């Protein structure tokens, strides 16, 4: 890829499972006789990750719009390999097992996911406001998980009831059917533009769509599709 970058070509790098690079390094290092560090990892995992990652950089001659994938062992995000991967990123996305088991298959955990360009003057003030407000309401649901589990939804305040209902509708609405997942979700793909996403979530936070039961937010594109589904169901 570096040759195409040096000529100015806009390269897309799709390296898959960089954790397996780290794991192979760990195995060979164990064979090589180096003392292990932390959970049986090579002592030079930081330097190895630095050497591999720093070559993945957009240069003034040409830009590499990289996109990696990482495998956390077990589900421990504190493992050394993902831990070293985190500090080498501009847009981190974290997929949680709990969300995936609920059939919200994009499974992106909004709270743990973030990006550097989520700046009011880089991605737009409206986009920033909507994203931050979505995280806030979600964070609130995370705080109230225990109360909702034990005492139930009824006990907590009416404002908190509304925020929790909106948060559930949100995390359902993050679900989306992809073109490549047709054989699992019978619905076809949805290429929701960023503008439609911002408008849809702004409307959802505003109140537009509060009457809609949360079930209709599962596997839909922009908010117009949710409205059409609800109206079709009357």
């Amino acid at each position: 890829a570096e040759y195409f970058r040096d000529e100015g070509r806009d390269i897309l790098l799709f390296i898959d499972n960089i954790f397996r690079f780290v794991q192979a390094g760990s195995e060979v290092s164990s064979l090589l006789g180096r003392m292990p560090s932390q959970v049986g990892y090579q002592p030079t995992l930081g330097t190895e990750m630095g050497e591999l990652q720093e070559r993945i950089t957009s240069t003034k001659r040409g830009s590499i719009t990289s996109m990696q994938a990482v495998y956390v062992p077990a589900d421990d995000y504190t493992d050394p390999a993902p831990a070293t991967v985190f500090s080498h990123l501009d847009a981190t996305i974290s997929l949680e097992r709990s969300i995936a088991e609920r059939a919200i298959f994009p499974a992106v955990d909004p709270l743990a996911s973030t990006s550097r360009i989520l700046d009011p003057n880089i991605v737009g003030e409206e986009h920033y406001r909507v994203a931050q407000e979505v995280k806030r309401v979600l964070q609130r649901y995370k705080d109230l998980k225990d109360i909702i589990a034990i005492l139930g939804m009824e006990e907590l305040s009416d404002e908190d009831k509304l925020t929790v209902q909106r948060a559930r509708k949100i995390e359902l609405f993050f679900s989306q059917p992809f073109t490549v997942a047709q054989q699992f979700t019978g619905r076809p793909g949805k290429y929701v533009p960023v503008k439609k996403t911002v408008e849809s979530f702004a409307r959802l936070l505003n109140g537009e769509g509060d009457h809609i039961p949360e079930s209709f937010f599962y596997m839909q594109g922009d908010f117009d599709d949710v409205l059409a589904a609800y109206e079709a169901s009357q």
């Binding site: 003392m35 589990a149 034990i150 139930g152 009824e154 006990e155």
Partner: protein, 285 residues
């Protein structure tokens, strides 16, 4: 995940489960005393109902059917009686009754009729204050085993507003005690239609020494007052049953969370011991 914070979480949830079991058994005791009070109060209304049946059978003249017997035409203003638990943790009972009151208000406004609501219990009062429609009359801090004098403060106000023409029809919504598992709201009227307890099965002409007008004027307020009393006492029984069920479910959920947290704590302890032993073994080598 630290194997010590999880211990604190387990201890806290265990305390939650224990306090919730206490809530469940006390609420069961209150539910049983409330059901006993319902049974004890039952005979009075049980007798007044056929009295209403007979009186309605006798009084047929629309002109002499005054007071609460005026089926006034061109309905403008209607009053509704909502009875709610004093405190929370009742489950979905308050949600059900308040949603019923809300749809009632919307339907009455659809007919262009102004509505006024009198709230029994703090939760109804607070809900209606927050919605922005202040209740005209409220009777909070009601006892577990209230006396009819407590409900008089709202009943006499409602009937005075009825007689003066301020309100034309009177309704009551309360948490009906269908069963110890289900307590749905139920709407009832307080404008005696034909007293359908036993219809007009009994047919004995009575002498009204006070007089027909005096008899009706004295008895109809009493009948609506005992109807309100019965609804409030039924609602108290439903409240206690619903709290008992809600606490039973909460205790079960707390025990399930204790099991889940114990599993997580066990896994954390095993991982901590593995890290311990691996580090000391590596230091040995």
């Amino acid at each position: 995940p630290s194997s010590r914070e999880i211990k604190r979480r387990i201890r806290s949830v265990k305390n939650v489960a224990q306090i919730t079991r206490a809530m469940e058994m006390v609420s069961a005791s209150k539910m049983r005393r409330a059901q006993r009070n319902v049974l004890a109060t039952r005979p009075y209304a049980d007798r007044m109902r056929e009295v209403m049946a007979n009186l309605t059978a006798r009084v047929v003249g629309a002109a002499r059917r005054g007071t609460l017997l005026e089926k006034r035409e061109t309905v403008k203003s209607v009053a509704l009686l909502v009875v709610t638990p004093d405190r929370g943790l009742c489950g979905s009972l308050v949600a059900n009754v308040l949603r019923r009151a809300g749809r009632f208000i919307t339907e009455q406004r659809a007919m262009g009729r102004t509505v006024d609501v009198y709230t029994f219990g703090r939760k109804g009062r607070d809900f209606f204050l927050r919605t922005g429609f202040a209740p005209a009359g409220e009777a909070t801090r009601l006892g577990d085993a209230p006396k009819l004098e407590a409900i008089l403060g709202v009943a006499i106000s409602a009937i005075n507003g009825f007689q003066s023409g301020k309100y034309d029809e009177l309704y009551i919504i309360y948490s009906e005690f269908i069963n110890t598992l289900v307590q749905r709201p139920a709407i009832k009227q307080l404008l005696p239609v034909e007293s359908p307890d036993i219809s007009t099965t009994t047919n004995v002409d009575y002498t009204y020494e006070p007089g027909e007008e005096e008899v009706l004027n004295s008895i109809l307020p009493r009948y609506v007052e005992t109807q309100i009393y019965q609804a409030v006492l039924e609602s108290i029984a439903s409240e206690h049953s619903a709290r008992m069920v809600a606490m039973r479910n909460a205790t079960n959920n707390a025990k399930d969370l204790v099991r889940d947290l114990t599993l997580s704590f066990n896994k954390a302890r095993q991982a901590a011991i593995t890290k311990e032993v691996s580090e000391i073994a590596s230091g040995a080598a």
